[PDB]
């Protein structure tokens, strides 16, 4: 099978620049300047829709800013400029072989300025503590990037690994980022411990911050 | 216009199967052939196979073959994909698309709103809510965060409202994470100024519409 490769994995631009993403293959995907490379755009929650198709043929709807390039192996899309509808993801696809494949995909991202995260703990409710189990919440508001990195340390130095991460997609005004880690320990378990703190860890941050309760 | 219509989500047990509908309209149904595409949650595309609804003609993945099979219904224009023998793997989105040609490359132009298939032994199970009470006296600052936990629940999707549809600034829904429990579990928080805690009553409404659970919880 043909072999698509897109990068960057994500690329994160400002409204008005302009991007290039490339897709490379395997294997030559041509013959005799006749191309079998196609471009979709798909946004979350959303069907892909096709952008360009023979390597180079713009699709009805899409706009002149967009233009794909490349032969043999080496193909790029390029967005001269970035208006907020170009914000989503991009796959490169191949259908010179059988089976057909896509590429891994690029997402452009809404580059900002870089965010301290506001830090939360949240200690186990009552109705929790009676079902038997507890969960300890630990939020993470609006921040940039979305690289970040949350620390349970029960009891100290004892940090565990029982947590589940969710972040949320980038604002549709401030282009932020939300994070939110819980640790679900038995109401027994939560019983014999008493310092519970979550270590965050952001460039925004002069040092790595931490919020923990008793 | 020209457009292709598919079948509602559908939750099915491990090891049963799924019979998936795209029905076309806007034009000559078996002038063109029909793709199929998957979308496992959080990965990318990935083509199944592909129908020539005129003779009947497939042509699988190698990799889908014996697990997914194709089928057309020129009379009511409906193509059809099933897959059976389900497992957890099969949970995806699964997009039909209208296939086209151009100097011997094809490419999809019209994709379908695609249909998502949930594998799994859940059982519809309604959500619980355990308020996430704002501090514990940490004041200092001016804004605070409070939320409201949905435990435990299935299928998805939830809807988290807050002050009841009127309340939409700083609010902070986060996807659902799947337990081990093969149960659901989602979050719904809005930052507020530590000035109005005392003076507002915050409640987060929750609908799950498959069990039927509206819960109204006051942080």
Same mark, same amino acid.
Not at chain 1, 124 to 148: H, I, M, W
Not at chain 2, 18 to 33: E, H, M, N, Q
Not at chain 2, 184 to 190: E, G, I, K, N
């Given at each position: 099978?043909?072999?698509?490769?897109?990068?960057?994995?994500?690329?994160?631009?400002?409204?008005?620049?302009?991007?290039?993403?490339?897709?490379?293959?395997?294997?030559?995907?041509?013959?005799?300047?006749?191309?079998?490379?196609?471009?979709?755009?798909?946004?979350?929650?959303?069907?892909?829709?096709?952008?360009?198709?023979?390597?180079?043929?713009?699709?009805?709807?899409?706009?002149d800013?967009?233009?794909?390039?490349?032969?043999?192996?080496?193909?790029?899309?390029?967005?001269?400029?970035?208006?907020?509808?170009?914000?989503?993801?991009?796959?490169?696809?191949?259908?010179?072989?059988?089976?057909?494949?896509?590429?891994?995909?690029?997402?452009?991202?809404?580059?900002?300025?870089?965010?301290?995260?506001?830090?939360?703990?949240?200690?186990?409710?009552?109705?929790?503590?009676?079902?038997?189990?507890?969960?300890?919440?630990?939020?993470?508001?609006?921040?940039?990037?979305?690289?970040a990195?949350?620390?349970?340390?029960?009891?100290?130095?004892?940090?565990?690994?029982?947590?589940?991460?969710?972040?949320?997609?980038?604002?549709?005004?401030?282009s932020?980022?939300?994070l939110?880690?819980?640790?679900?320990?038995?109401?027994?378990?939560?019983?014999?411990?008493?310092?519970?703190?979550?270590?965050?860890?952001?460039?925004?941050?002069?040092?790595?911050?931490?919020?923990?309760?008793? | 216009?020209?457009?292709?219509?598919?079948?509602?989500?559908?939750?099915?047990?491990?090891?049963?199967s799924?019979?998936?509908?795209?029905?076309?309209?806007?034009?000559?149904?078996?002038?063109?052939?029909?793709?199929?595409?998957?979308?496992?949650?959080?990965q990318?595309?990935?083509?199944?196979?592909?129908?020539?609804?005129?003779?009947?003609?497939?042509?699988?993945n190698?990799?889908?073959?014996?697990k997914?099979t194709?089928?057309?219904?020129?009379?009511?224009?409906?193509?059809?994909?099933?897959?059976?023998?389900? &497992?957890?793997?099969?949970?995806?989105?699964?997009?039909?698309?209208?296939? &086209?040609?151009?100097?011997?490359?094809?490419?999809?132009?019209?994709?379908?709103?695609?249909?998502?298939?949930?594998?799994?032994?859940?059982?519809?199970?309604?959500?619980?809510?355990?308020?996430?009470?704002?501090?514990?006296?940490?004041?200092?600052?001016?804004?605070?965060?409070?939320?409201?936990?949905?435990?435990?629940?299935?299928?998805?999707?939830?809807?988290?409202?807050?002050?009841?549809?009127?309340?939409?600034?700083?609010?902070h829904?986060?996807?659902?994470?799947?337990?081990?429990?093969?149960?659901?579990?989602?979050?719904?928080?809005?930052?507020?100024?530590?000035?109005?805690?005392?003076?507002?009553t915050?409640?987060?409404?929750?609908?799950?519409?498959?069990?039927?659970?509206?819960?109204?919880?006051?942080?």
């Amino acid at each position: 099978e043909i072999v698509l490769t897109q990068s960057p994995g994500t690329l994160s631009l400002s409204p008005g620049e302009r991007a290039t993403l490339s897709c490379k293959a395997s294997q030559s995907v041509d013959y005799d300047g006749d191309s079998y490379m196609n471009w979709y755009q798909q946004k979350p929650g959303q069907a892909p829709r096709l952008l360009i198709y023979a390597a180079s043929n713009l699709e009805s709807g899409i706009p002149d800013r967009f233009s794909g390039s490349g032969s043999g192996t080496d193909f790029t899309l390029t967005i001269s400029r970035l208006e907020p509808e170009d914000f989503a993801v991009y796959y490169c696809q191949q259908s010179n072989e059988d089976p057909r494949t896509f590429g891994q995909g690029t997402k452009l991202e809404i580059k900002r300025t870089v965010a301290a995260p506001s830090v939360f703990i949240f200690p186990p409710s009552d109705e929790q503590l009676k079902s038997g189990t507890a969960s300890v919440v630990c939020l993470l508001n609006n921040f940039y990037p979305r690289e970040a990195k949350v620390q349970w340390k029960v009891d100290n130095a004892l940090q565990s690994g029982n947590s589940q991460e969710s972040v949320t997609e980038q604002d549709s005004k401030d282009s932020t980022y939300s994070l939110s880690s819980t640790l679900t320990l038995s109401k027994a378990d939560y019983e014999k411990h008493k310092v519970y703190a979550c270590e965050v860890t952001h460039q925004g941050l002069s040092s790595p911050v931490t919020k923990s309760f008793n | 216009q020209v457009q292709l219509v598919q079948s509602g989500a559908e939750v099915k047990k491990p090891g049963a199967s799924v019979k998936v509908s795209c029905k076309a309209s806007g034009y000559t149904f078996t002038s063109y052939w029909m793709q199929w595409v998957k979308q496992a949650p959080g990965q990318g595309l990935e083509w199944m196979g592909e129908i020539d609804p005129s003779d009947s003609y497939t042509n699988y993945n190698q990799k889908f073959k014996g697990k997914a099979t194709l089928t057309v219904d020129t009379s009511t224009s409906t193509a059809y994909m099933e897959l059976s023998s389900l &497992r957890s793997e099969d949970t995806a989105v699964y997009y039909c698309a209208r296939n &086209r040609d151009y100097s011997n490359n094809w490419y999809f132009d019209v994709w379908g709103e695609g249909t998502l298939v949930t594998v799994s032994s859940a059982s519809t199970k309604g959500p619980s809510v355990f308020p996430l009470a704002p501090s514990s006296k940490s004041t200092s600052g001016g804004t605070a965060a409070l939320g409201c936990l949905v435990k435990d629940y299935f299928p998805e999707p939830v809807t988290v409202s807050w002050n009841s549809g009127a309340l939409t600034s700083g609010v902070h829904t986060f996807p659902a994470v799947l337990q081990s429990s093969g149960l659901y579990s989602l979050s719904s928080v809005v930052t507020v100024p530590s000035s109005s805690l005392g003076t507002q009553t915050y409640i987060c409404n929750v609908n799950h519409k498959p069990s039927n659970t509206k819960v109204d919880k006051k942080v």
